[PDB]
Amino acid sequence: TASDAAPLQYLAPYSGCSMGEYFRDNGKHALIIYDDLSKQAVAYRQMSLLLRRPPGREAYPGDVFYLHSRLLERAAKMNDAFGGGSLTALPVIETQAGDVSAYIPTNVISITDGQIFLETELFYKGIRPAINVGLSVSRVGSAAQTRAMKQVAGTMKLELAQYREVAAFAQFGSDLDAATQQLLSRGVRLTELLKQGQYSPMAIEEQVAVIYAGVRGYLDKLEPSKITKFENAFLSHVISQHQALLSKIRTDGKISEESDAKLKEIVTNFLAGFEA
Amino acid sequence: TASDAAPLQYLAPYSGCSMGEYFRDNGKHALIIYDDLSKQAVAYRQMSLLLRRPPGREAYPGDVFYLHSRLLERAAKMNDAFGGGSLTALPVIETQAGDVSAYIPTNVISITDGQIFLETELFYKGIRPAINVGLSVS
Amino acid sequence: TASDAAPLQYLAPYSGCSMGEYFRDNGKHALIIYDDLSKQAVAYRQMSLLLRRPPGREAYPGDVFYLHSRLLERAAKMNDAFGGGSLTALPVIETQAGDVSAYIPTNVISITDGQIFLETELFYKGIRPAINVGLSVS
Amino acid sequence: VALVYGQMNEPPGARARVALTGLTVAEYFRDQEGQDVLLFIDNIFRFTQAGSEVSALLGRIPSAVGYQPTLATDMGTMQERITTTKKGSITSVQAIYVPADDLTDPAPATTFAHLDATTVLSRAIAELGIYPAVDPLDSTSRIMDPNIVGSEHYDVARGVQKILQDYKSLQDIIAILGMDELSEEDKLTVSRARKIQRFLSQPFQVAEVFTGHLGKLVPLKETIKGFQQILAGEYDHLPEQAFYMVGPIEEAVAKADKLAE
Amino acid sequence: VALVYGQMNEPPGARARVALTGLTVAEYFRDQEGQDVLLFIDNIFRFTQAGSEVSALLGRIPSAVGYQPTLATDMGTMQERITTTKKGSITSVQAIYVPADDLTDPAPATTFAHLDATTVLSRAIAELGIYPAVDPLDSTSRIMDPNIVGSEHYDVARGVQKILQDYKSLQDIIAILGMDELSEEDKLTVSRARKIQRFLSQPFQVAEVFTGHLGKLVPLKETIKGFQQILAGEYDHLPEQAFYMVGPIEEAVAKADKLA
Amino acid sequence: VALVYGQMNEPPGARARVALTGLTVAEYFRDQEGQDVLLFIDNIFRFTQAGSEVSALLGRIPSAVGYQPTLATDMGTMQERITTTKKGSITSVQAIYVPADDLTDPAPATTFAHLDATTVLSRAIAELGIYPAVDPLDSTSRIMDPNIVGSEHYDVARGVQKILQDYKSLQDIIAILGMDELSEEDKLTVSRARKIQRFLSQPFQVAEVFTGHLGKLVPLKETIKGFQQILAGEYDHLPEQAFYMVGPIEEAVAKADKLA
Amino acid sequence: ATLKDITRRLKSIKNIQKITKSMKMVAAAKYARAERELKPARVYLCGAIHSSVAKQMKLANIIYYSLKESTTSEQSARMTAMDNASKNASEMIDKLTLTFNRTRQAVITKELIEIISGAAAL
Numbered sequence A: 001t002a003s004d005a006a007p008l009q010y011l012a013p014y015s016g017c018s019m020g021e022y023f024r025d026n027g028k029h030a031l032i033i034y035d036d037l038s039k040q041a042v043a044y045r046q047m048s049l050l051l052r053r054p055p056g057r058e059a060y061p062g063d064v065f066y067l068h069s070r071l072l073e074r075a076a077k078m079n080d081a082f083g084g085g086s087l088t089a090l091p092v093i094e095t096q097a098g099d100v101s102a103y104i105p106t107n108v109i110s111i112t113d114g115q116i117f118l119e120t121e122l123f124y125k126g127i128r129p130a131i132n133v134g135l136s137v138s139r140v141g142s143a144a145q146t147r148a149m150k151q152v153a154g155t156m157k158l159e160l161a162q163y164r165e166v167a168a169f170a171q172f173g174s175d176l177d178a179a180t181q182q183l184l185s186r187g188v189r190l191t192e193l194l195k196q197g198q199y200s201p202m203a204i205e206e207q208v209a210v211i212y213a214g215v216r217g218y219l220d221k222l223e224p225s226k227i228t229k230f231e232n233a234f235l236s237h238v239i240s241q242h243q244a245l246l247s248k249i250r251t252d253g254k255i256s257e258e259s260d261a262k263l264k265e266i267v268t269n270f271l272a273g274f275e276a
Numbered sequence B, C: 001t002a003s004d005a006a007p008l009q010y011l012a013p014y015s016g017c018s019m020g021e022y023f024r025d026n027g028k029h030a031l032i033i034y035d036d037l038s039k040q041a042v043a044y045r046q047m048s049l050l051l052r053r054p055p056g057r058e059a060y061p062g063d064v065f066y067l068h069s070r071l072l073e074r075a076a077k078m079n080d081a082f083g084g085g086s087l088t089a090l091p092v093i094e095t096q097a098g099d100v101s102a103y104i105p106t107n108v109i110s111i112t113d114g115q116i117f118l119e120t121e122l123f124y125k126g127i128r129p130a131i132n133v134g135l136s137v138s
Numbered sequence D: 001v002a003l004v005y006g007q008m009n010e011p012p013g014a015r016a017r018v019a020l021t022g023l024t025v026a027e028y029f030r031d032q033e034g035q036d037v038l039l040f041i042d043n044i045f046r047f048t049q050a051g052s053e054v055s056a057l058l059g060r061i062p063s064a065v066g067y068q069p070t071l072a073t074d075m076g077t078m079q080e081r082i083t084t085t086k087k088g089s090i091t092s093v094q095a096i097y098v099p100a101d102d103l104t105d106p107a108p109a110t111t112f113a114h115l116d117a118t119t120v121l122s123r124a125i126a127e128l129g130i131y132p133a134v135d136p137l138d139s140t141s142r143i144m145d146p147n148i149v150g151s152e153h154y155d156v157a158r159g160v161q162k163i164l165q166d167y168k169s170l171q172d173i174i175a176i177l178g179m180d181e182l183s184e185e186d187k188l189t190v191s192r193a194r195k196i197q198r199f200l201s202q203p204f205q206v207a208e209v210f211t212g213h214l215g216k217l218v219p220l221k222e223t224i225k226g227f228q229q230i231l232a233g234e235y236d237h238l239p240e241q242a243f244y245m246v247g248p249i250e251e252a253v254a255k256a257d258k259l260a261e
Numbered sequence E, F: 001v002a003l004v005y006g007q008m009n010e011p012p013g014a015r016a017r018v019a020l021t022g023l024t025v026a027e028y029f030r031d032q033e034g035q036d037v038l039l040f041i042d043n044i045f046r047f048t049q050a051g052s053e054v055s056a057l058l059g060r061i062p063s064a065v066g067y068q069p070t071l072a073t074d075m076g077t078m079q080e081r082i083t084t085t086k087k088g089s090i091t092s093v094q095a096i097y098v099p100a101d102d103l104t105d106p107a108p109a110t111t112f113a114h115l116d117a118t119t120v121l122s123r124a125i126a127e128l129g130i131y132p133a134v135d136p137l138d139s140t141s142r143i144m145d146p147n148i149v150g151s152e153h154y155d156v157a158r159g160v161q162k163i164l165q166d167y168k169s170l171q172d173i174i175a176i177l178g179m180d181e182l183s184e185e186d187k188l189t190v191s192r193a194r195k196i197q198r199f200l201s202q203p204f205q206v207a208e209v210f211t212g213h214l215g216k217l218v219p220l221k222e223t224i225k226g227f228q229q230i231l232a233g234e235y236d237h238l239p240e241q242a243f244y245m246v247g248p249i250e251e252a253v254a255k256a257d258k259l260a
Numbered sequence G: 001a002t003l004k005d006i007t008r009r010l011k012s013i014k015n016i017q018k019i020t021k022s023m024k025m026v027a028a029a030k031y032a033r034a035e036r037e038l039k040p041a042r043v044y045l046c047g048a049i050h051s052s053v054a055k056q057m058k059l060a061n062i063i064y065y066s067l068k069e070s071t072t073s074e075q076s077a078r079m080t081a082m083d084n085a086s087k088n089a090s091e092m093i094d095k096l097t098l099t100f101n102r103t104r105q106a107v108i109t110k111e112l113i114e115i116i117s118g119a120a121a122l
Helices: A006-025 A037-050 A064-072 A103-111 A120-125 A147-172 A178-193 A204-215 A224-240 A243-251 A257-274 B006-025 B037-049 B064-072 B103-109 B120-125 C006-025 C037-051 C064-073 C103-109 C120-124 D012-031 D045-058 D071-079 D106-114 D151-177 D186-199 D220-231 D249-260 E012-031 E044-057 E071-079 E106-112 E123-127 E151-177 E186-199 E205-211 E220-232 E249-258 F012-032 F045-055 F071-079 F123-128 F146-177 F184-199 F205-211 F220-231 F249-259 G003-042 G049-056 G060-070 G072-120
Strands: A029-034 A086-091 B029-034 B086-091 C029-032 C086-089 D036-041 D089-094 E036-042 E089-095 F036-042 F089-095
Touching: A006 A029, A006 A037, A006 A064, A006 A086, A037 A064, A037 A103, A037 D071, A064 A086, A064 A103, A064 E044, A120 D151, A147 A178, A147 A204, A147 G003, A178 A204, A178 A224, A204 A224, A204 A243, A204 A257, A224 A243, A224 A257, A243 A257, B006 B029, B006 B037, B006 B064, B006 B086, B037 B064, B037 B103, B037 F071, B064 B086, B064 B103, B064 D045, B120 F146, C006 C029, C006 C037, C006 C064, C006 C086, C037 C064, C037 C103, C037 E071, C064 C103, D012 D036, D012 D045, D012 D071, D012 D089, D045 D071, D045 D106, D071 D106, D151 D186, D151 D220, D151 F146, D151 G003, D186 D220, D220 D249, E012 E036, E012 E044, E012 E071, E012 E089, E036 E044, E044 E071, E044 E106, E071 E106, E151 E186, E151 E220, E151 G003, E186 E220, E220 E249, F012 F036, F012 F045, F012 F071, F012 F089, F045 F071, F146 F184, F146 F220, F146 G003, F146 G072, F184 F220, F220 F249, G003 G060, G003 G072, G049 G072, G060 G072
Parallel strands: A029 A086, B029 B086, C029 C086, D036 D089, E036 E089, F036 F089
Antiparallel strands: none
8 A cells, every 4th residue: 555665566466466376277267456557657666766777758667568567467368288277357557637648558558458448528427337438448359258248249339339430410410310310319228228336246147138128129219318217127127027037048148039039028018117 | 137147146036035124124115026037947947957956847946936935935914013014026927828837837826925917819909908817816 | 771870871971972072172063862861860869869968859969950051061052263063962851741840850941942842642632743832942 | 723834935844844743743633532633734735845856955866747756655654644543533634736737747646546535626617717616527525425425415416517527528619610500408508507617606705805705605405406406407597697606596596686687 | 380479578678689580580481492481570569669678778868759769770670681682582561559649659650661561451341341351542552653563553453442432432422312313423433333342352261261161362463354344344234242252353253143 | 241150061169159259340330439230140049059069068967958058148148248338329130040930949938038129930921921921919029119109100000910819819710610600890800800911911122033023112101001091991892912912002902903 | 739738629629520520411411302392493500691691681482482492502501611611620630630749749758858857967
């Protein structure tokens, strides 16, 4: 913390890394969150300059890139020959006025496999979590999604990208064709489905059930203002009454033609209930 | 003035201040205009760099705030116990491209008891004095 | 060229100039083409930062205008009493994004006796030479 | 109330320490007496400017923006004492100067992490005559949680912020393209936003010399409700001006009449 | 292929030199065996950055934007070893990262001083299913000069692009006002353009283990003819999909047959 | 005329002192002969630049933008001798080169305070074809006082600036949307402003080879007048082009006939 | 200029350019419809429309005429007008970006030069 000498703030991430390596190496899986790499960079810069090493841009030492790369590379997926164990790392970087190109944000972006970009404008507009879906990325991609998710994730990703093309028009769309007027609607509902309260992470099966609902078109006639309420209650319902379908989805790992049909009815009857 | 040595330009404000305190400390009233505190800062900056004191933000000494705070704190209203005299100061600062957020401009705006901000836009427009109502305060 | 030490890139234009000067000095007429003064300027700046001279606008050393004025002052038209000879210089300067206000371009415009500005727009649109007839001058 | 002072007429040194003296007095009542302390510091930036002023004479290569290389740690070992413990409680209100108005300046920037609630004031708001000039979209509190203030409190707050954000985005655009083309749906949020923008101002009891208005103190429920109604469309008839420099929503209604002529 | 690696954990000096090491290797297949080697530097920006780190460490004053004082020489001493000598030639495909999307940033700006062509891969094109997903209007080359590729080559190329450009124009119209105020003329530019767009796609032998399709290595001659004729109007009767993922025009013809 | 020169080809020290030298010559006529002098200097910015050239060599920590910490005092003890006194008069005209066009540059920035009148030239205006390219809202003169130029002069002067200032704020919108959406009233300022802007230009003998027109010299009362009328709406019927490149207003009316 | 100032305009002129562009596609649409409906009727921010009539300003059979015409001309006018407005917004988004990057760069160099200047005076 804040009052601990620079060197301890400097070290912290490595000493935490080692701890996570014990799991990685032993066929076990470990997750590590560095919060933040921005403050540690500062700690390091402070010692560098006090030891009088040469300062480069932003007063950072020439080896600041090497401080993080040697840290973030220790995260990896081993081979069975080595135990198949892993170390995933979620490093946090604090940008300034959204300057993702400032020095440290540039290094770390350049080192990692993807970025989840959060934005104030989004946050205050009601999108929480504030993920900017267009600029966020996952180099690993689907190589890491489940077949269940992919079954849905894929068309969602696509209507959203499509909405993003037209979104700006909405607010002045004094007379748009029903083609694009369609994408605006899918656009705002899909967006409302991505919203989420905190401290309540969902089970992959619950996420696909809800995503399926709007992606399939079921909430298209529903009011944007209600999707948050719909999902909540809809999900409360299937987590209550339908734990056998979710268990299927879960197990079968995908949405069978059957479970597909069962969901159709579950949502078309719940929706009816819903707008009574 | 312009050809006087940097140290004279630097001192000038403190000199003039002291002549104003005579009135302030003797139950009389004085008004001092520091025209301007921008050129003094430059003088200070010059004197200071030539002494080999490491330059700071914008090339000025790390203590330019202090340079002006020390001076302007002297303008004051004494109680009857001290004569009830006073010293009122009207320091001038020159902005560039009407940018009042600038470091020096704000350094000095954060010492005085208000500011009168004049804009060239208002001036050309016919509004003279070019006082900017919104940005000036007391 | 691109692979010779900066000092050689820096030097190159002065040497060529001296060769053009023989002709100028003997009633003859030479033409010198400096391509480009942009890169000579960065070669000289590499030298200057390595010698530790204070970097200024765009990190260029304070004397880069003179790097160029000295060179281009040597192009000249002598009168009969000195041979009538002459040296004509067509120095080249590379702007970024058509920005003709940059430090180096401006420097050089303030030395030569006109410019020939070629525009990228013109070039694609099929007008070549991509000369900008309103902006260019002699 | 005990008072400790190291003003602007002092040498850097005094300025680099008064906060310590002040804070030390406060820690006594927290620990040795176990009481509930209220700590006011105006302005903590001065502690950091003090240090930057002697820094070069201490022989240090400057960090960015002229600051000393030990800014954050210097701030850390201090800010970490200004805190509530199990022994006593401190409620610190620290004024934080923002050089050149730039919130990213290493100092203001480095201080956010030490706070649980932040009130960001803006000259752009002040310039319009809206006091207190708090920026509604740049101010935050760690208790703005439905689990802590309640959903009515929470939905209103966020409701007010969405509309001000929604209006911020349109501002630059109706600026040029004008307002006709806007959807009645969107020219109502321009309305409500402009009224909220005002309903957020308030005549302070310590600024009558400034506003020429009697200071009003509004109770938490009068606030939540007033905004709830503006957001609800319950005053789309009153004029914006009726909402400027008033306490509770009823004064906005009364002021409408007074303005009614 | 020989692979030379300078991983991100390596110190500045290592990521600094590894592109030279790779260079060394390639120079052999040219100066010792006089081949036409291919050099791939991925990515050219990290080369430059490694340069700055090393520079800063040696305590030299950075220049504009924080790069090294020797940015231009560090680059030149390497780029220049990549050429066609009498013995053979090294050709380099360099992956470029543009900082801040700023093409006038010193890193990128310096780099273009040496480039003779750009290959712009485009996500948009990919979305058309078109692959390779190269952008026919954004990708460029210094040697696209009739004085270098010859008038024929030069004209076909300039023919392909204009048509592709024109169609781009119409693209806006089509979607809004609907595809028909379109002239006997405007309807042909589209048709052909759409045939062209496809004829520009192609099956790679590298992706055979996967596309279940046979890779094609079309020859330059075949390339110019192909497009020549489409421009010409020789296959206006052929249908679009006849041209998707094929090699030489001959295949466009035969695919049409199997497509009745 | 006495001529003193230390040009672009001299080493820094020469350029750093020739001003002093021309200056001294002038001081002699002023004080030793009580003479009315005229002192032309091209360019006084070069003296300061010269100073910046040697300053590192003198071993000084640089001030902002790499200039010498003694910039102002150096300008000062030099500028302060270029002045009229009780003994003699010195009318001095000094050209001040502005680097990169930046008037916030320490050199030019520090020079404003030494003048009584300033003529700030603009690339933007020059590029519009208006010569001299003087910025009307940026040039000033301590004589622009009603009690010195008379109120007639003082009111036309402030009249012209007010309309150009007004035109200036409309420009942002004119820029995306043109004039259509403009108020009938606003469009009249625009018309008048564009006619005042053109009438401010004029052919110089010295620039005849470039204007293609004969140089003109307009008498003050002709200027005060011509501008009154324009302001007063006495020429709202003439076209802008009538006012471009002319002397007296009477010539602007004529040009209008010729334009037919 | 301030990167934050420049990013405001850019932020907004980028929007104005997409709005404006959208308004033309609409204006073209209606104008398609109109040129057709116009055909028959003769056998019986909109540019300088409302003003042109306004200045020169100081049944049914013909009412539907002046109407059926005044809408082709209008939807024509809005169309071109919004066509050039985004043409203007684009020259600006390209113009401002250059000012943004000159400043962006300049700000970084200016700072470093300040640091280097102070370090070197020790």
